[PDB]
Ligand binder design. Structure first.
Ligand SMILES: [Ca+2]
Ligand SMILES: [Ca+2]
Length: 67
DNA sequence: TTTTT
C-alpha cells in the first residue's frame, strides 16, 4: 500500500485528492473508501491506498483511514 | 468522478 494524506476532499460531492510526498496527487472517489456507511475523508487524514487505472487515468483504490 | 483526454 502507498501512504499519503488527504489533500482535498469535497465532502458534498464525494471526491478529492490524496497527496504523496514527491509524487503526483492521486484522485480519490468516495467509492474507493473502505468501511461501512457514508464514505468520506477530511483533509489532513492519513490514508493507505493503491493506484489503479480507471477510465480516465490513475485513481485511488482500497483507501483506508490510518492513525 | 479530476488536478480526467
Ligand atoms: Ca507502504
Ligand atoms: Ca474539504
Amino acid at each position: 500500500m502507498l501512504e499519503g494524506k488527504v489533500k482535498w476532499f469535497n465532502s458534498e460531492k464525494g471526491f478529492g485528492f490524496i497527496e504523496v510526498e514527491g509524487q503526483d496527487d492521486v484522485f480519490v472517489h468516495f467509492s474507493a473508501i473502505q468501511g461501512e456507511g457514508f464514505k468520506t475523508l477530511e483533509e489532513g487524514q492519513a490514508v493507505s491506498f493503491e493506484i489503479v487505472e480507471g477510465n480516465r487515468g490513475p485513481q485511488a483504490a482500497n483507501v483506508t483511514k490510518e492513525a
